[PDB]
Subunit: 99 residues, 5 copies
């Protein structure tokens, strides 16, 4: 499951830890209100992947997307640290796992 | 099939929902009139992939090209939310599905 | 073979169409007289992939590069629309095909 | 094991050499205090991938992430030159191996 | 073996042609004097791939990094046009070959 490192970093914020998720859908949407990138788990949960224009978050967010797409393609599980303050919940950190 | 979330976001628009599309061709064309990115389906269907220079749509459009190609390479299915206004229809949201 | 859509766009131009090409070499060169990106087929034909710096062509040419490298790495045939008004002939449109 | 070249380079620095690492986790985090890119090995070790905004280090930093993500995806081991001072240690150079 | 085109092109220069090289290591280093992107063949040979900030060289050197990483990842061979003007030698042109 999540690395202690990951668990610990997450338990330090207001986000919630989601472990061993299997994403089966990857979404790109430029429609006015739904504008964004989302992922869907094999149990129907939906998450919004964070987006940033400025350095450095523009980097990590770009990596969150690669990680996300990689998971959908390979069937690799991921561990998330998502904030439940928005709907869909937004991903603040993501861990791809090969194991 | 398309995710409930995906459907939800598409129906609220004037675009039509296309499900379980098997993409077999990916095209990049720079000739004056057909200037664009397109994807053809196993059924002959053809869509144009939206283009954008500014943030943040430049991000989603880039993820759209990544998803399509991926579909072509992996023979993985996609659900689209496309505008029947243009010829070929333009992609406004797309969903890559593992299952 | 080449999608009808693909065939039609090529025909409206000065260029010509080449189908079912197996690309076996991908080339990057920065030499003074031959700097460029090229691909070579199983038969020994060579083409230059077009290049550009400004939007929106830089986007499409980048996609041409991606398509060419994917073909070489996976052995997936491509259909091209290339101008014989240069040597080697320049690619103006390219279609990646799984089917 | 590390190439003589890689080893020799790592030895001119205050950094230390780690060989044949098997990375199993790739992390993207945008949280206030944890913001950053990290990898975790099969043994439980954690390393932060360096970041840079300006040329040309933004290029190297970019390859490092790719090298890192590639290892996690394909399972190939990496040799790193990391600063043993910080926690997690910071990677300054990385070498991907196949053989 | 190298394409006639690639050979012709390299024989136009002062550099040397190196055919059928198996790349086994790929390096990214930001350390001061050793910063650069390097490739190591299965016989211990080392070459440097240059970095260019400006167009069009930022495009070509970027693809060289992709070919390099790819050759290392898939086991595919490459033919190089390399200059002894530096140590390690710089790659002026590179050809990924599936043939």
């Amino acid at each position: 499951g999540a690395s202690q490192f990951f668990k610990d970093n997450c338990n330090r914020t207001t986000a919630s830890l989601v472990e061993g998720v299997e994403l089966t859908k990857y979404i790109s949407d430029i429609n006015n209100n739904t504008d964004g990138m989302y992922v869907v788990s094999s149990t129907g949960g939906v998450w919004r992947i964070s987006r940033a224009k400025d350095y450095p978050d523009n980097v990590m967010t770009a990596e969150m997307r690669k990680i996300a797409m990689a998971a959908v393609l390979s069937g690799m599980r991921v561990n998330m640290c998502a904030s439940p303050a928005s709907s869909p919940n937004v991903i603040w950190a993501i861990e791809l796992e090969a194991e």
